[PDB]
């Protein structure tokens, strides 16, 4: 009490309020499932994300809509600051009707200074600058150097942005989503569970480092299309993508960070596999690979080939499945499998196993 | 088919020439010269604060120029700006992509950056007109994961992404002014010189390269590690730098001598290095080995000086204050201990 002062007590009160919201967000993040999604390039993860995350099932959250429209205003400010920089860094000088344009640039800096809300007079002076036909034709020349791809949508709708009434759409956040760099967080709700699918994709070449952050996870979805034995995705003479998938599952399922987290393995294209196994047998590939000529036992044998890649571990169980064109079955299997994983981990935490 | 081979032979000849040069100028090693200085043997530092409020595990931290505020990034979504002297939180920035691997703190105290797995560097403004912390800029010109972000001024940031290149940005413009691309592996760490004229960068191919921000060319290149590099920190004179790796070997490379000086390797460590920091004098060597505890090497005799134990998991990032008052370790047990 002696060391504390008025502002120190108010800072401790703010720290208690912050720690309270921190803990609330932490228990909200503990009431939700985070799960990884690795898949081969031949396999196809997009269709899995589209069937598991229905647009009609999960609408856009109203609370994040203010953050989304703030992103929209920030992209508008970025677009107009790129326009005034292009009219400042222009190699061949272009005549301007207003000499105050450069001061207008500073003015666009001044609205950059506050950035509280949309400034009406800033929209008016940007509209007056855009009224010049040379400023409109400058965008085609600005396409030459490094520029935002989703910039014409904001720079052509400047009068529509100038209206204070605004419409939130999934196309609006798709304009920011189209950059598609990095991991994608797809959020969907099912039976009071908040699933968060993290698909890392083929953006990054080497994974010796950034797999180590995925230690705290619940499931590992692993989508491989078993029709790849005849299909071609080869940077070398190894035409069989199935061996690539076997090495992938051997590197992931036997990894030191994933020694307690299970793998839900999805055989994606089974109808194409059925057609291509009725057309030609799997005996051509390898003899031991061909357990039986029939569809069913081979469909067992492939998943058996994934069951014995787990090197001696009994604390993680491969929940195998065959993907069909039904939204209910796949989401219900993910629900039941992740629920089983959560039950096993919490009972291991209790010590009952 | 033959021109590529003879250019490769010319490159091998140049590597043999620079190896013979650095061997020829290597008459007296540092460990032979430092046998007369008085060694420090008992460096016992006690934890003075254990910061609490992180649900998930820490990946980075960075001290301010005032030695009182320290940023910290974790996976729980909230990037927390701690006040060190009195344990209370100052800001908890909600991140968009919670899979962040780095953070920084501007030398003016205004901005705070963070990269992550989303291949984007989010720079936040703190001293703004409002009380919240808004997303100021989002530098998204990278392809690989970001590993270290550093602030030169409130206008220039240097980032180490995982697409085998570093960048040099202007913040308000949004585009990368300079692209530093000679690395072959994923670039893992940065270290700035105190005069902010040149920086070293460590990749996964054991090559620590010194880049110059003025021109944009690779000034120097160092290769002395068996495994991949995880962390680098300059010497406070700016003429040398320590470098960590997964081969349990800190190595102190020299700039004017253009080679390694000493090797801070013990025999009972089969554990990786995750972060490396120097004190103000540069006598100590704070090394975050991932055997659940930190270690204090002597940067002139390669002797151990103190184990900083007390973390339940891997120490992910540690930093010494800019005045030298303390050193804070952030580990995967979600704690931020301040050893003094």
């Amino acid at each position: 009490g002696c060391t504390l002062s008025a502002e120190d007590k108010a800072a401790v009160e703010r720290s208690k309020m912050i720690d309270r919201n921190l803990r609330e967000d932490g228990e909200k993040a503990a009431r939700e499932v985070k799960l990884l999604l690795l898949g081969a390039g031949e396999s196809g993860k997009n269709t899995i994300v589209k069937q598991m995350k229905i647009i009609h099932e999960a609408g856009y959250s109203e609370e994040e809509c203010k953050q989304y429209k703030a992103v929209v205003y920030s992209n508008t400010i970025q677009s107009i600051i790129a326009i005034i920089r292009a009219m400042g860094r222009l190699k061949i000088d272009f005549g301007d009707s207003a000499r105050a344009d450069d001061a207008r640039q500073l003015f666009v800096l001044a609205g950059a200074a506050e950035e509280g809300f949309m400034t009406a007079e800033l929209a008016g002076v940007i509209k007056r600058l855009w009224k010049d036909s040379g400023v409109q034709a400058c965008f085609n020349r600005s396409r030459e150097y490094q520029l935002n791809d989703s910039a014409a949508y904001y720079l052509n709708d400047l009068d529509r942005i100038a209206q204070p009434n605004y419409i939130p759409t999934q196309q609006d956040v798709l304009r920011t989503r189209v950059k598609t760099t990095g991991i994608v967080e797809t959020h969907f709700t099912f039976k009071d569970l908040h699933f968060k699918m993290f698909d890392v994709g083929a953006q990054r070449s080497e994974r010796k480092k950034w797999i180590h952050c995925f230690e705290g996870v619940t499931a590992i979805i692993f989508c491989v299309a078993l029709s790849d034995y005849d299909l071609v995705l080869a940077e070398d003479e190894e035409m069989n993508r199935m061996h690539a998938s076997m090495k992938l599952f051997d590197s992931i399922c036997n990894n030191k960070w994933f020694t307690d987290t299970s793998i839900i393995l999805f055989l994606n294209k089974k109808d194409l596999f059925e057609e291509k196994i009725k057309k030609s047998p799997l005996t051509i590939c390898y003899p031991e690979y061909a357990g039986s000529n029939t569809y069913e036992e081979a469909a067992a044998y492939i998943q058996c080939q994934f069951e014995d890649l787990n090197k001696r571990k009994d604390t993680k169980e491969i929940y195998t499945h065959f993907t069909c064109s039904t939204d209910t079955k796949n989401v219900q299997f993910v629900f039941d499998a992740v629920t089983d994983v959560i039950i096993k981990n919490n009972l291991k935490d209790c010590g009952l196993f | 088919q033959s021109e590529l081979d003879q250019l490769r032979q010319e490159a091998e000849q140049l590597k043999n020439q620079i190896r013979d040069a650095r061997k020829a100028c290597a008459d007296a090693t540092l460990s032979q010269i430092t046998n007369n200085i008085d060694p420090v043997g008992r460096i016992q530092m006690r934890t003075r604060r254990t910061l609490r409020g992180h649900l998930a595990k820490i990946y980075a931290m960075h001290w301010g120029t005032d030695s009182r505020l320290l940023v910290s990034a974790s996976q729980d979504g909230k990037l927390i700006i701690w006040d060190s002297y009195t344990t209370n939180k100052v800001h908890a920035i909600p991140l968009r992509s919670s899979w962040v691997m780095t953070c920084a703190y501007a030398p003016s105290g205004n901005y705070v950056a963070c990269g992550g797995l989303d291949n984007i560097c989010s720079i936040y403004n703190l001293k703004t007109r409002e009380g919240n912390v808004r997303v100021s800029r989002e530098l998204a010109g990278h392809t690989g994961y970001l590993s270290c972000c550093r602030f030169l001024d409130d206008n220039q940031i240097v980032t180490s992404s995982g697409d085998t290149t570093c960048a040099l940005w202007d913040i308000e413009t949004g585009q990368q002014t300079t692209t530093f691309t000679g690395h072959t592996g994923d670039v893992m760490s940065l270290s700035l010189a105190p005069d902010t004229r040149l920086f070293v960068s460590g990749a996964c191919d054991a090559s620590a390269k010194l880049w110059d921000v003025r021109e944009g060319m690779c000034r120097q290149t160092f290769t002395g590690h068996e495994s991949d590099i995880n962390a680098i920190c300059f010497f406070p004179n700016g003429n040398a730098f320590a470098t960590g790796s997964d081969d349990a070997t800190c190595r102190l490379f020299d700039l004017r001598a253009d080679q390694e000086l000493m090797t801070y390797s013990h025999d009972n460590i089969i554990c990786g290095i995750t972060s490396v920091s120097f004190s103000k004098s540069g006598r100590l060597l704070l090394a975050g080995y991932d055997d659940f505890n930190c270690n204090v090497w002597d940067a002139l005799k390669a002797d151990r000086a103190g184990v900083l134990a007390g973390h339940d998991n891997r120490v992910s990032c540690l930093g010494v204050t800019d005045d030298g008052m303390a050193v804070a370790t952030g580990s995967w047990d979600s704690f931020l201990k301040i050893w003094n």
Epitope: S5, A6, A10, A11 | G131, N132
Partner: single-chain antibody, 232 residues
């Protein structure tokens, strides 16, 4: 940053009145809010304070119990309900923002000031000077004497300097008598050690005239200064 407060102006003494302050333009949900009286032809004086999230409420000694106060976060509004008004409460009321962290500038923004007229221990901040006539363009020195050593153990001396233009609202211009506020030009400096503090103006301008207040923020209640005015 817009604070518009309303309520009152012709109130019978002994009756209740509820004043509403709308807060638009900032994160109101994490701001402790203060109130400030200003009697006609007299100095400013503190009323009450609400912490962030309404955790800890403080009142002044002379208005304790008679007033009640509330914060509505989803509408971003602040309500001051005053019961059993006295004949000395005829004043202009200011509802001001405040945020408390290291390097923060609380009391930085001021309301326009609502008017409320009625029909009819403490750290005393003894400002000796009250009016200094001076021409524009010279160094001006305003002294502020306290009654308690404001130098706390943690090293920062909790005294703030405030500028109020004639016919306008007050404005924070110096916090903790070393640092300058976000928006003031680099002309105003603060010096002194614990007992006595000094505001030094390098060059004076047409916008630099007004009344200067000094506030101690070491202990509640926040007793203000008399207010030294500058005329030309």
């Amino acid at each position: 940053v817009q604070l518009v407060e309303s309520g009152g102006g012709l109130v019978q003494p002994g009756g209740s009145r509820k004043l509403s302050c709308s807060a638009s333009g900032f994160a109101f949900s994490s701001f402790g809010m203060h109130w400030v009286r200003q009697a006609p032809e007299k100095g400013l004086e503190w009323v009450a304070y609400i912490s962030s999230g309404s955790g800890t409420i403080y009142y002044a000694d002379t208005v304790k119990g008679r007033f009640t106060i509330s914060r509505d976060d989803p509408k971003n509004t602040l309500f001051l309900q005053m019961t059993s008004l006295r004949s000395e409460d005829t004043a202009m009321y200011y509802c001001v923002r405040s945020i408390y962290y290291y390097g923060s500038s609380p009391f930085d923004f001021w309301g326009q000031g609502t008017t409320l007229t009625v029909s009819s221990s403490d750290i005393v901040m003894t400002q000796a000077t009250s009016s200094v006539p001076v021409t524009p363009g010279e160094s001006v020195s305003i002294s502020c004497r306290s009654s308690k050593s404001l130098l706390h153990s943690n090293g920062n001396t909790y005294l703030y300097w405030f500028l109020q233009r004639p016919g306008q609202s007050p404005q924070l211009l110096i916090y903790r008598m070393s640092n300058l506020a976000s928006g003031v030009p680099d002309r105003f400096s603060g010096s002194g050690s614990g007992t006595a503090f000094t505001l030094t103006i390098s060059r004076l301008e047409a916008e630099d005239v007004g009344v200067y207040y000094c506030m101690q923020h070491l202990e509640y209640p926040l007793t203000f200064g008399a207010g030294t005015k500058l005329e030309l």
